[PDB]
Amino acid sequence: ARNIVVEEIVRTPVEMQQVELVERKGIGHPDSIADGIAEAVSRALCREYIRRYGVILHHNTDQVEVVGGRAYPRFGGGEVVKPIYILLSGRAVELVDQELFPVHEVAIKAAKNYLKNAIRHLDVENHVIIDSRIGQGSVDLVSVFNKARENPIPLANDTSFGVGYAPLSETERLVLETEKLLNSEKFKKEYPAVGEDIKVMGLRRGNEIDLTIAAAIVDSEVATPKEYLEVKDKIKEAVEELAKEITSRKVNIYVNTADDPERGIYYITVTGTSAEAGDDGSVGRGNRVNGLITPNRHMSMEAAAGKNPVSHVGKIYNILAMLIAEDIAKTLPVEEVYVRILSQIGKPIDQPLVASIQVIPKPGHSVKEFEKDAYSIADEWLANITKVQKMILEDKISVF
Amino acid sequence: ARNIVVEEIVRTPVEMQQVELVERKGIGHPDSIADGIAEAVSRALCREYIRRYGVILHHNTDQVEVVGGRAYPRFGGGEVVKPIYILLSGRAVELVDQELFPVHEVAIKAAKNYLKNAIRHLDVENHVIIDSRIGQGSVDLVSVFNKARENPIPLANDTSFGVGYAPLSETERLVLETEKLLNSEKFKKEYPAVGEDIKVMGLRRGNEIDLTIAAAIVDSEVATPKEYLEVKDKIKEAVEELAKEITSRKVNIYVNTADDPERGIYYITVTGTSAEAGDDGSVGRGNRVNGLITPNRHMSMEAAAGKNPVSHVGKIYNILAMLIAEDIAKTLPVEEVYVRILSQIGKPIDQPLVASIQVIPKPGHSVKEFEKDAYSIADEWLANITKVQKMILEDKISVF
Ligand SMILES: Nc1ncnc2c1ncn2[C@@H]1O[C@H](COP(=O)(O)OP(=O)(O)CP(=O)(O)O)[C@@H](O)[C@H]1O
Ligand SMILES: C[S@@+](CC[C@H](N)C(=O)[O-])C[C@H]1O[C@@H](n2cnc3c(N)ncnc32)[C@H](O)[C@@H]1O
Ligand SMILES: [Mg+2]
Ligand SMILES: [Mg+2]
Ligand SMILES: [Mg+2]
Ligand SMILES: [Mg+2]
Ligand SMILES: [Mg+2]
Ligand SMILES: [Mg+2]
């Protein structure tokens, strides 16, 4: 009864296309900082709503503005001159039965806690000003969310679509795992100088990949330009070892391409994030739920970070489409699968207006052989969409 | 001498796929407000930079946060209780040879002027607080003039990427023209109750299109819920006529699906924008430069609104790719044309690393019959990239 449509599409697989471009904005990137703050605020509000009332109340904190500060990085240790200003926005329930909910206290505390754990060399108390302007949702949009027990499956709060796909190409996996490696605790233990503001661009032309990495180096961990260049080489070497595990194509690796040692220009920072130096961020300006920006693929413009995991489809459908695509790619003979799920505002989220599954079958296979299998996969995920909510609160899935 | 490559691509045309999704956020939509303000601020800064110094100085105002307020909409005329808060962010040159440039005065005045001309029932002076945190750039004019002399066409410092396509499918044209119609001046005088916060979602399933419209209705123009339902029907009728002008497919029109008259839930607003109440906005969260959100196509994540129209290569490339595609589709026999432009480091931006032109020819035609014509089109646009910049500053091209 669910509007699931499985169709064959003709197209050159991404792996066979001549030009493939993939980008990822690391954790310390201002846009990703905004995403992370939005998500941390949302999850904190969920937990606190449950802790106080045993139920999640309406709130979408998918609105964070990172206003870059000013800093003077110096080898051996720089200084921030003007702190980073972060405006928390969005919607949250502040009035609960005439009692006041600590919206701003929870949001600001969650934002700060995320920055403390995400950016290691960022002094949150002195390098960051966090203000909260989170408002209260509209009397009507709040009503569809409030239909809890009335609708065991929550109703969709908007008419929006989520887009996912699978499997990842070699270039996509390379870009994704490059950022994850350079921002993993293990790699940080090995090279503390590598900040979190890491931007990875993978550009494949034929069977040759150019992997450009922009990695902010913490100036307190490098005393001289030579130490900085050595940190760059270790980044390169680590990514070389990783690339050999991911693809047999030739991989050219470039680290901080804007550097000009002859002019003393170096990508060093005080805190490890370019947000310190006049670079701005906001929600929905970077990675999709799969952690990548893939113009060779298809994407939804719906941001996932900060949206409640109960009713907002921009987050739920982007996650579900990705998971449906992954399961199809993992179990059925498909070269590629793209999933698009469209909500109708005021319809249960398990009854999308359409769940489009476009498949490129592997050579020798026809879609009629497994179309019902793909149908069942999407139907089961849509029938268990509520599980995605738990996956968010239990920190089992990332949204950027 | 330009690396323009015209290739044939074999793939299911969008018009031929079973499921197509298209979305457009009208001018009054909070995200579109942020985009519109971002671009309006940028254009105001450009004009004022030129008026004072005869040259545009660096600036990026692609950071605007529309914080929803609070309102009590009532049939016959409601009231705003908490004004909308808009934060202008980004960076701009405020010190020009140590003399002060009115960055914030220009920006806030431009944001207000854009709102006054965009949302007709919005009292900007009492319903909106606009504050600016745009950062300070310092420039010595001798340097900007010297980097002209040296390079008339700016050189690319990074690998930037633009994507365009043409022609628009019937569903894309239907979504686009629906928003344009309902937000046209003629329709506004005929139905003043229809606000500017108009979001159109088009779903094509085979040869049946479901067209969902979310239109904020001005509560001062509808005296009773019945008049509100009547306005909805008038929208439906106008779009029915428009649909018959575009396609011979079955078109189902749905307007404000969240309404629940039995519980008094209505999409009425005081100002004609949901920014007054339960929706927030930020830049780069909605339409692409072609005015649409198209998951069946290849979109860029890059926000174009607010980015400098002379120096930001990603914005001009996305616009140029769109224009190249449109010119190709309107002049040559192609079912579809996808245009991708990649810049080459330290080369002029009119000398891209590659200008990929992928074309699906119409039946009976082959690409080699018209490949040189498509080459010339893209070559001419790349040679007139500066004129395109002028078109942007002269408000002759839209970016959302
Ligand atoms: N010296 C430097 N070298 C390389 N990268 C740097 C850098 N300083 C900052 N960066 C990184 O580049 C980003 C700003 O560069 P830029 O504005 O040209 O990219 P962009 O136009 O694509 C906006 P976005 O970063 O959101 O994609 C910073 O946020 C940071 O991640
Ligand atoms: C549904 S709101 C997003 C949800 C909201 N931000 C929240 O916190 O739940 C997004 C867009 O939908 C439209 N919209 C707002 N209220 C609506 C309603 N009651 N019915 C239909 N569409 C609505 C507006 O154009 C708005 O920009
Ligand atoms: Mg950005
Ligand atoms: Mg939002
Ligand atoms: Mg949305
Ligand atoms: Mg939005
Ligand atoms: Mg750049
Ligand atoms: Mg970028």
**CB A79: neighbour CB atoms within 10 A?**
13
Interface test with B, best of A356, A375, A400 (most B CBs within 10 A): A356
CA A100 vs CA A61, A92, A291: distances in Å: 18, 12, 36
Query: Please, where are the H alpha helices in A4-88?
Result: 30-53
- Measured from the Cα of A90, ligand 2's closest atom is 8
Instruction: At B181, list the tokens.
Output: 């119609």
Q: How far out from the chain centre does Cα A248 lie?
A: 27
CA B107 vs CA B27, B60, B114: distances in Å: 19, 11, 10
Q: How far apart are CA B44 and CA B102, in angstroms?
A: 11
Q: How far apart are CA B8 and CA B86, in angstroms?
A: 47
Q: How far out from the chain centre does Cα B62 lie?
A: 12
Instruction: At B373, list the tokens.
Output: 């014509």
**CB B396: neighbour CB atoms within 10 A?**
9
Pick the residue from chain B with its C-alpha nearest to A139: B278
Can you point out the beta strands (E) in B173-311? 194-205, 208-218, 250-255, 268-269, 281-282
Q: How far apart are CA A250 and CA A244, in angstroms?
A: 9
DSSP H or E run through B356: strand B354-361
Q: How far apart are CA A253 and CA A202, in angstroms?
A: 9
Query: Please, where are the H alpha helices in chain A?
Result: 30-53, 103-118, 124-127, 141-146, 170-182, 185-190, 225-246, 313-331, 371-383, 385-393
Spatial CA neighbour of A111 closest among A84, A147, A144: A84
Name which residue sits closest to atom 17 of ligand 1, judged by CA. Answer: A279
Residues 6+ apart with CB under 8 A from B189: none
**Per the CB < 8 Å rule, is A5 touching B205?**
yes
User: Which of B21, B67, B281 lies closest to A342 in CB terms?
Assistant: B21
Kindly list the protein residues that place their beta carbon closer than 5 angstroms to ligand 3, a single-atom ion.
A 31, 285
Residues 6+ apart with CB under 8 A from B360: B8, B9, B10, B11, B13, B334, B335, B336, B337
Spatial CA neighbour of B179 closest among B222, B139, B215, B227: B215
Strand arrangement of the beta sheet that strand A281-282 belongs to: A128-132, A84-92, A59-67, A281-282
Cis amide bond preceding B192, omega within 30: no
- Helices B313-331/B385-393 angle, 10° precision: 100
Q: How far apart are CA A144 and CA B266, in angstroms?
A: 12
Q: How far apart are CA B141 and CA B96, in angstroms?
A: 7
**Per the CB < 8 Å rule, is B65 touching A65?**
yes
Can you point out the beta strands (E) in B133-273? 135-139, 161-166, 194-205, 208-218, 250-255, 268-269
Instruction: At A270, list the tokens.
Output: 């005080």
B140 is in an annotated binding site: yes
Can you point out the beta strands (E) in B256-301? 268-269, 281-282
**Per the CB < 8 Å rule, is B280 touching A91?**
yes
With H, G, I as helix, E, B as strand and everything else as coil, classify residue A153: coil
Q: How far apart are CA B290 and CA A99, in angstroms?
A: 47
Straight-line distance from the first to the last Cα atom of chain A, in angstroms, rounded to the nearest whole number? 32
- The secondary structure of residue A350, as a DSSP letter, is T
List the beta bridge partners of residue B113: none
Top-tier CATH class for A22-26+169-282: alpha beta
- The secondary structure of residue A362, as a DSSP letter, is P
CA B379 vs CA B3, B5, B163, B358: distances in Å: 9, 11, 16, 15
Burial of A208 (0-12, 13-18, 19+ CB in 10 A): exposed
Length of chain A: 400
Kindly list the protein residues that place their beta carbon closer than 5 angstroms to ligand 5, a single-atom ion.
A 160, 302, 314
- Helices B30-53/B103-118 angle, 10° precision: 130
With H, G, I as helix, E, B as strand and everything else as coil, classify residue B226: helix
Residues 6+ apart with CB under 8 A from B105: none
Bridge pairing between strands B99-100 and B128-132: unpaired
Q: How far apart are CA B359 and CA B337, in angstroms?
A: 4
Q: Are B27 and B36 in contact (CB under 8 A)?
A: yes
Q: How far apart are CA B242 and CA B202, in angstroms?
A: 14
* Centroid of ligand 6 to alpha carbon of B205 (angstroms): 25
- The secondary structure of residue A286, as a DSSP letter, is S
DSSP H or E run through B189: helix B185-190
Q: How far apart are CA B303 and CA B64, in angstroms?
A: 11
Q: Are B258 and A140 in contact (CB under 8 A)?
A: yes
Can you point out the beta strands (E) in B142-182? 161-166
Q: How far apart are CA A311 and CA A219, in angstroms?
A: 43
Spatial CA neighbour of B311 closest among B154, B138, B141: B154
Q: Are B195 and B28 in contact (CB under 8 A)?
A: yes
Residues 6+ apart with CB under 8 A from A209: A170, A171, A174, A202, A203, A243, A247, A249, A250, A251, A252
Q: How far apart are CA B278 and CA A178, in angstroms?
A: 39
For chain A, what is the radius of gyration of the CA atoms?
22
Q: Which amino acid is at A26?
A: G
Instruction: At A207, list the tokens.
Output: 């069977």
This entry's atomic model was obtained through X-ray
Spatial CA neighbour of B174 closest among B252, B234, B111, B226: B252
Q: How far apart are CA B147 and CA A31, in angstroms?
A: 30
Contacts of range A43-50, beta carbons closer than 8 Å, 24 or more positions apart: A43/A110, A43/A392, A43/A393, A43/A395, A44/A106, A44/A107, A44/A109, A44/A110, A44/A113, A45/A92, A45/A103, A45/A106, A45/A107, A45/A110, A46/A308, A46/A309, A46/A392, A46/A393, A47/A393, A48/A101, A48/A102, A48/A106, A49/A93, A49/A101
Q: How far apart are CA A194 and CA A182, in angstroms?
A: 8
Instruction: At B103, list the tokens.
Output: 């960055």
Q: How far apart are CA B313 and CA B316, in angstroms?
A: 5
* Centroid of ligand 6 to alpha carbon of A301 (angstroms): 9
* Centroid of ligand 2 to alpha carbon of B274 (angstroms): 7
- Helices A30-53/A103-118 angle, 10° precision: 130
Please give the angle made by the CA atoms of B198, A38 and A398, to the nearest 5 degrees.
105
Spatial CA neighbour of B399 closest among B287, B262, B294: B287
Q: Are B15 and B186 in contact (CB under 8 A)?
A: no
Residues 6+ apart with CB under 8 A from B347: B155, B156, B353
With H, G, I as helix, E, B as strand and everything else as coil, classify residue B168: coil
Residues 6+ apart with CB under 8 A from A398: A289, A291
**CB A1: neighbour CB atoms within 10 A?**
5
Instruction: Establish whether residue A60 lines the binding site of ligand 1, counting it when its CB lies within 6 angstroms of any ligand atom.
Output: no
B139 is in an annotated binding site: yes
Tokens 């254009």 sit on residue: B43
CA A154 vs CA A145, B277, B330: distances in Å: 7, 22, 46
Q: Which fold has domain B30-156?
A: GMP Synthetase; Chain A, domain 3 (3.30.300)
* Centroid of ligand 7 to alpha carbon of B92 (angstroms): 16
B76 is in an annotated binding site: no
